Design a binder for these strands. Structure first.
Lengths: 314, 282, 279, 136, 136
RNA sequence: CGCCACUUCAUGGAAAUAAAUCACUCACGAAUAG
C-alpha cells in the first residue's frame, strides 16, 4: 500500500510481480488476440505496474537493519542510471501490451529486490584469471583470457595491499582460496570456520527520496531496418539507490606460492627458516577493497555491456 | 590499458524518454550497438563482413557465429547533474512569463511529436489563453505537473563521461582511434537524424582530441554538405536563440526538400518532386 | 534436562538438497519428510552442520558428537539430534509482506511430538496449543479455513486468490504462542497448506553457468524461504554438564549463526537456533 | 513425482498426432526449448500466464508453438479417459473439448490444483518423450 | 544382489563392444559417474525416465553417455541367451532388436518387472566390471 | 500562422554439467571337550 515498504502495510513485491500480476478481473481479457492488444488490458497492467513502482524504502528500515545485524557491516554502493537488472531471464510474459516482459529477482519472504550471492560470486570471479574451465571448447580462449585477467588482478592487488610483487602461481592460489576455498590442484586445506569467504545476497537498502523500482524500455530494431521495432518493457532498480553488499571475508596468508591457514602460518613464522619475501598477506579489509574495485570496474546484473548495474561510492 | 574514460561535449539537445531521473544522460543501449557496427565497418575498410572476420580472428567478438556484438563494457555517467530541459514542438507559440530557469523552448523544430502539449487542453504543458487587452496575441501559462508528466524532454547537460572497459588491449586501442569518428558520424536520440543527437569527444584519456569534423565526415559518408548560417552577432549570448535559428533553418530546408512551403507568402517547389518530374518526366 | 525443543530461524534461504534426479523443471529439490512430505532437515545434516560450527573445540565435539571419521578409536555420540520438521513457512500476501503459515495438522504433529518426547516446557505449550486446536476445529466445522489473529489482516490473500483470510473473534492467540510460531500467524487447512507447500509452489531460484560471459548451463533450485521456522528435538545423553552448558550457551546466543545445507559460499542456509522459551 | 510409462505413451501419441514428430521420427529442434520454457513459465509465473503465452498462434515464432498446448490437451484427455469411478467423484474426469481454449477451460473451471498437477505431469511427459526422439 | 560372474563377463564383452574401453585398457573418466548415477536414476525416478535420460544423444555431456545404454542392452541380450527354456519359466528369452531403442522396447513390451530386474543387475555388473580398467 | 495523428509491445541460444557411489573397525569371544 503506497510508499514506505514496511512489514506492516505493504504488498509483497514478488507476489505482486509474479502471482497477482496476471489475475483475472471481471472485464479484463488477455487470452484472445484482441484482448492482449486492447487498452483495457493496457490500463490493467498500467495499474499493476504503478502498484509495483509505488514503494519506497527508508534508511532505517527494520528489514535492512535486520540484514545488517545478521550479515555484518554492509558495503554500500549507489546505482548509476542505466538502472540495475537482475534475474532478467526469468519467464514473465503472456504476449500482452503494457506488461513487464522480463523477469526480476525478488526475495520470496521479504519481497525486497536483491542480487543473489551466486551472482555476486560469479561477477567477482569473472575478472579473475581462473574463472574459465579447460573443457575443450574453451581451449582457444583460455590462454588469452588468463593473461589479461592476470595482469588486471595483479595491478589490483598491488593497488589494494602493501605487496610489491606477486606471481601467477600466487594469483592462482589466492583466487582458488577466495572462491573455491581449496587449492588449484584439487585437494583442500584445513581452514578454520571463520577462514571462509561467503558472498551473501546484496539487498536494496535505501531509496532516499524516490521509489526503488522503475519501468524501462529496450526496443530491438530488427535486422530488417524497414520493419516495425519491438518495444519491450521491464522492471529496473532506480538510480541513486543504496545497494548493501554483504560479505564474510577473512585474511589470506600466502607463504611461498601456496595458501596457508592461520594455524599453519603461525608455525611457519615460528620456524627457524622464514622469508618475509615469501610471506604475503591480504587482509579482509583489503579483500573487501579489491571486491569493491572490481564491482566499480565491471558492475553487477544483466545487460552490463549495455551499462546496467554500475556503481559509485556512497 | 584496459579502460577508456572519455569526456564528450553536447552540441544539440537530446530528446530523452526517461527524463524523470536527474541522472538522465546518453543511453549506452544506442551507443554500443551502433559503435560496434561502426567499428566493424572500419575494420573491414568499409565492409561489415570483412570487419566481422577481422574481429573473429582477433577474438574480439562475444559470439563468432551469430551477432555483431564486440566484447567491451560501455558506461555513460553524468559528472554534474544540472540539466537544461527543453520543450520541442513543431509550431511557434508565445513564451510564458512565469518560467523555471531550466526551461527553454525550441518551438520551430523538425521534431513534430507531442505537438498537443502547447494546446488549450488541460493536459498541455503550456496552456494557451486568450489575452484581455487584445482579443489576439494568445497568453501563455505554465503547468508544473504537465511539464513533469511529458513523455519526452529535450535535455542539454554539461561535459560528462563515457567509460569503455575491456580486457582486450588492441580493441581498446582501435576504439580510441575510431571513437571521435563514431561520435562525429552518428546521432543519438529520438528524431536523431534531424540533429537531436550531436556530440563531440573532447578528452579521450585526459588528452585533447584533435579530430577534424570535416575530414571524418568526408571519410564515412557518401556526400557531406556544409551550410554557413549567418550568426547574427551574439555567439556569446542566447544559446537558446542559436538553437531556435538552427532548428528553424533545419525545418525550413527539410520541408523545402521533400515538400513545398505554403507559408506566409513565398512559394518554392519540392525538390524531391522536381527531381522525378525532370528525370524521365513521367 | 534430557529432551529439549529448538526452533530454527533461517536468516537466508535454505537448500538441504535431497539425493534426487528430477527430470522436470526443478533440477535440485530439497529434502521432504518421509511421512508428511513437508520440508525438513535430516538429522544427519543438522548434526554435521552443528559439529562443523563447534569443530574448533575438540573436546566439546568429541564428547557431544563423537569421534572423527578418520580415527583409530571411535567414540559414540552422546547428544541425540532429531530431524528438523517444518513449523512455520512465510507466505506472500497483499495486505502484509509475509505471514507465518502453520496448518492444523502441523499443530497436531507438534502437540503429539511434545507429548511423546516430553520437552522441558512442554506442559503449558501442549495445553494452550490443544485449546487453540479445539477452538479452530469448532469454528471450521470441516470446511477449509484461513484464520488470522489480527483483525487488520482480514481478507488477506494467502499466496493464492482462493485462500482468503478471516478473523475468528473467539480464539485468543497467547503471546508465547506468537513468539513460538511467528508474529503474523495464519493457520490453514491441510489442503491449503499442502497446496502452498508443494513442489509447484515452493520458491524456486534460477542459476546458470557462464563461460567467458556466455551461458554454458542452466538449472533451477528449490529453496526453503527465508525466516522459515523448523523445530527439532535435542536429547542429552550421559554427557558432561560443563560441555553441555557450553554447547547450549553457544548455540542459543544471538550472535551465533550456523550454516545448514548446501551453497554455503553463496549465502544459502544461515540459521539462528533458539531454545523453547518458558510459557 | 514419478512419470508413468502410460503417460509417456500418451505423450508420444499426442506428439505424433499434433504433427510434431515427423513420419521419420524426428522433430524440429526448437520444440525442446519450447517445452523447457513452458515448464519454467508454469512454475514461475503460473498456469494462466504460461498457457496464455504458449496458446498464442500470432507469435511470429520459428515454428507452430501452439502444438505443445495441443499435445498438452491430448495428454490430459488421455489421462482423464482412464479415470476410475472412485476418482471421478473427486476429480473432474470430463474430456476437454477439442475446439475449446485451454486457458479458457482452466479459467472457467477456477484454478484448481487438479489442473495444475495434470499440466505438470503432461509437461514432464512431453519433455521425456521429446528426449526419446532425434532432433533434426 | 550378489556378484554374478557370468554377468560380469557379459559386462566386459559389452564394454569392449560398445567402444568404451580403448585398445589400451582405459576409458573416459566420466563413464564411472554415468554407471554410478544410472542405478540411482532408475530407483528414484523410474526406469523409463532414467533410460530416456541416458539414451539421449542430444546431451551436453563430456562423452558419449548413450554408450552405456547400448552396453546395458548387450548385457540384457546376453542374459536372455542362456535362459533355461521351459513351460513354467516366467522369463522371456526374446532378444532385444538392435534397431529398437531401449526406451521403445520397454514401452512396447509392458512387462517391466523382468526388465527392471535385468536392468538393475546389468547396471551393477557394469559398475563392478568398470573397475578392472584405468580411470583415465 | 491555423489545425492534426498513426504506428509498433519477444524472439533466438543455454534447460544442467562434473567430483565422491560408501570408507574404517569388529568377520566371532568365552564356557562346556583336552
Amino acid at each position: 500500500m503506497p510508499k514506505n515498504y514496511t512489514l506492516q502495510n505493504a504488498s509483497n513485491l514478488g507476489w505482486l510481480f509474479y502471482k497477482d500480476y496476471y489475475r483475472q478481473e471481471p472485464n479484463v481479457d488477455f487470452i484472445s488476440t484482441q484482448g492482449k492488444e486492447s487498452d483495457t488490458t493496457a490500463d490493467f497492467f498500467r495499474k499493476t505496474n504503478q502498484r509495483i513502482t509505488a514503494y519506497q524504502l527508508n534508511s532505517e528500515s527494520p528489514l535492512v537493519a535486520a540484514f545488517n545485524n545478521h550479515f555484518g557491516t554492509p558495503l554500500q554502493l549507489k546505482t548509476i542510471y542505466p538502472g540495475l537488472i537482475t534475474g532478467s531471464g526469468l519467464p514473465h510474459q503472456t504476449g500482452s501490451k503494457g506488461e513487464f516482459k522480463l523477469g526480476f529477482q525478488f526475495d520470496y519472504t521479504t519481497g525486497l529486490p536483491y542480487i543473489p550471492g551466486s551472482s555476486i560470486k560469479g561477477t567477482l570471479r569473472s575478472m579473475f584469471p581462473f574463472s574459465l574451465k579447460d573443457k575443450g571448447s574453451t581451449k582457444r580462449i583460455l590462454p588469452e583470457y588468463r593473461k589479461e585477467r592476470m595482469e588486471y588482478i595483479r595491478d589490483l592487488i598491488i593497488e589494494v595491499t602493501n605487496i610489491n610483487e606477486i606471481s601467477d602461481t600466487e594469483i592462482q592460489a589466492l583466487e582458488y582460496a577466495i572462491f573455491t576455498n581449496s587449492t588449484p590442484s584439487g585437494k583442500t586445506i584445513e581452514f578454520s570456520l571463520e577462514e571462509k569467504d561467503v558472498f551473501y545476497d546484496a539487498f536494496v537498502a535505501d531509496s532516499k527520496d524516490g521509489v526503488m523500482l522503475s519501468d524501462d524500455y529496450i526496443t530491438p530494431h530488427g535486422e530488417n531496418p524497414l520493419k516495425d521495432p519491438k518495444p519491450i518493457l521491464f522492471l529496473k532498480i532506480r538510480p541513486d539507490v543504496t545497494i548493501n553488499f554483504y560479505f564474510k571475508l577473512c585474511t589470506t596468508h600466502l607463504y611461498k606460492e601456496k595458501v596457508c591457514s592461520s594455524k599453519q602460518i603461525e608455525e611457519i613464522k615460528k620456524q627457524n627458516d622464514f622469508s618475509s619475501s615469501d610471506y604475503k598477506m591480504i587482509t579482509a579489509h583489503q579483500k573487501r577493497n579489491l571486491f569493491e574495485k572490481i564491482l566499480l570496474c565491471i558492475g553487477i546484473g544483466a545487460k552490463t555491456n549495455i551499462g546496467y548495474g554500475q556503481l559509485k561510492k556512497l | 590499458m584496459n579502460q577508456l574514460t572519455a569526456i564528450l561535449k553536447q552540441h544539440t539537445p537530446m530528446i530523452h524518454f526517461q527524463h524523470n531521473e536527474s541522472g538522465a544522460t546518453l543511453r549506452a543501449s544506442e551507443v554500443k550497438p551502433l559503435l560496434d557496427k561502426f567499428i566493424l565497418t572500419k575494420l573491414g575498410n568499409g565492409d561489415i563482413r570483412e570487419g566481422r572476420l577481422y574481429a573473429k580472428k582477433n577474438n574480439w567478438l562475444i559470439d563468432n557465429e551469430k551477432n555483431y556484438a564486440l566484447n567491451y563494457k560501455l558506461s555513460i555517467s553524468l559528472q554534474k547533474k544540472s540539466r537544461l530541459e527543453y520543450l520541442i514542438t513543431s509550431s511557434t507559440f508565445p513564451l510564458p512569463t512565469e518560467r523555471p530557469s531550466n526551461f527553454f523552448t525550441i518551438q520551430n523544430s523538425p521534431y513534430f511529436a507531442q505537438e498537443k502539449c502547447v494546446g488549450i487542453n488541460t493536459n498541455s504543458t503550456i496552456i494557451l489563453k486568450k489575452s484581455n487587452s487584445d482579443p489576439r496575441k494568445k497568453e501563455a501559462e505554465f503547468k508544473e505537473k504537465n511539464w513533469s508528466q511529458i513523455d519526452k524532454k529535450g535535455l542539454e547537460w554539461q561535459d560528462f563521461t563515457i567509460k569503455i572497459f575491456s580486457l582486450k588491449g588492441d580493441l581498446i586501442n582501435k576504439i580510441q582511434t575510431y571513437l571521435p569518428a563514431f561520435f562525429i558520424c552518428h546521432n543519438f536520440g529520438t528524431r536523431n537524424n534531424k540533429g537531436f543527437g550531436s556530440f563531440t569527444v573532447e578528452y579521450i584519456n585526459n588528452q585533447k582530441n584533435i579530430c577534424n569534423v570535416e575530414d571524418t565526415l568526408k571519410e564515412n559518408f557518401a556526400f557531406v554538405y556544409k551550410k554557413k548560417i549567418a550568426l547574427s552577432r551574439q555567439s556569446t549570448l542566447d544559446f537558446i536563440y542559436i538553437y531556435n535559428q538552427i532548428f528553424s533553418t533545419i525545418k525550413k530546408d527539410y520541408q523545402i526538400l521533400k515538400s513545398g512551403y505554403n507559408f506566409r507568402n513565398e512559394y518554392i517547389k519540392s525538390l524531391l518532386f522536381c527531381y522525378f518530374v525532370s528525370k524521365y518526366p513521367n | 534436562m534430557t529432551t529439549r525443543m529448538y526452533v530454527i530461524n533461517t536468516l537466508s534461504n535454505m537448500h538441504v538438497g535431497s539425493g534426487e534426479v528430477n527430470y522436470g523443471v526443478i533440477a535440485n529439490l530439497i529434502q521432504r519428510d518421509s511421512v508428511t512430505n513437508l520440508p525438513n532437515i535430516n538429522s544427519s545434516g543438522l548434526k554435521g552442520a552443528i559439529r562443523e560450527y563447534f569443530k574448533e573445540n575438540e573436546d566439546l565435539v568429541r564428547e557431544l558428537f563423537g569421534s572423527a571419521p578418520r580415527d583409530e578409536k571411535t567414540l559414540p555420540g552422546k547428544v541425540r539430534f532429531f530431524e528438523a520438521n517444518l513449523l512455520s513457512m512465510p507466505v506472500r500476501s497483499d495486505k502484509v509482506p509475509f505471514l507465518m503459515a502453520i496448518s492444523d495438522e502441523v499443530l497436531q504433529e507438534l502437540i503429539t511430538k511434545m507429548k511423546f518426547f516430553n520437552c522441558e516446557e512442554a506442559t503449558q505449550y501442549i495445553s494452550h496449543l490443544s485449546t487453540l486446536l479445539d477452538n479452530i476445529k469448532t469454528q471450521a466445522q470441516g470446511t477449509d479455513f484461513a484464520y488470522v489473529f489480527d483483525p487488520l489482516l482480514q481478507g488477506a490473500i494467502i499466496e493464492e486468490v482462493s485462500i482468503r483470510a478471516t478473523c475468528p473473534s473467539h480464539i485468543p492467540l497467547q503471546p508465547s504462542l506468537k513468539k513460538l510460531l511467528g508474529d503474523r500467524l495464519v493457520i490453514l487447512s491441510h489442503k491449503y497448506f499442502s497446496i502452498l507447500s508443494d513442489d509447484n509452489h515452493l520458491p524456486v531460484l534460477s542459476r546458470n553457468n557462464l563461460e567467458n560471459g556466455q551461458s554454458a548451463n542452466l538449472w533451477y533450485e528449490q529453496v526453503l524461504p527465508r525466516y522459515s521456522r523448523l523445530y527439532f528435538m535435542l536429547m542429552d545423553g550421559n554427557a558432561q554438564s560443563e560441555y553441555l552448558k557450553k554447547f547450549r550457551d553457544t548455540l542459543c546466543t544471538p550472535s551465533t549463526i550456523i550454516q545448514i545445507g548446501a551453497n554455503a559460499s553463496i549465502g544459502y542456509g544461515y540459521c539462528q537456533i533458539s531454545e523453547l522459551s518458558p510459557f | 513425482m514419478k512419470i508413468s510409462k502410460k503417460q509417456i505413451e500418451y505423450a508420444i501419441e499426442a506428439l505424433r498426432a499434433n504433427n510434431i514428430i515427423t513420419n521419420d521420427n524426428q522433430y524440429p529442434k526448437v520444440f525442446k526449448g519450447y517445452i523447457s520454457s513452458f515448464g519454467a513459465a508454469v512454475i514461475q509465473s503460473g498456469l494462466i500466464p504460461a498457457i496464455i503465452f504458449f496458446e498464442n498462434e500470432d507469435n511470429d515464432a520459428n515454428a507452430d508453438r501452439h502444438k505443445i498446448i495441443g499435445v498438452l490437451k491430448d495428454i490430459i484427455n488421455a489421462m482423464r479417459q482412464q479415470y476410475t469411478v472412485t476418482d471421478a467423484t473427486i476429480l473432474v474426469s470430463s474430456q476437454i473439448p477439442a475446439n475449446y481454449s485451454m486457458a479458457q477451460y482452466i479459467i472457467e473451471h477456477g484454478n484448481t490444483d487438479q489442473l495444475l498437477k495434470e499440466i505438470t505431469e503432461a509437461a514432464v511427459a512431453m519433455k521425456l518423450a521429446l528426449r526419446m526422439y532425434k532432433s533434426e
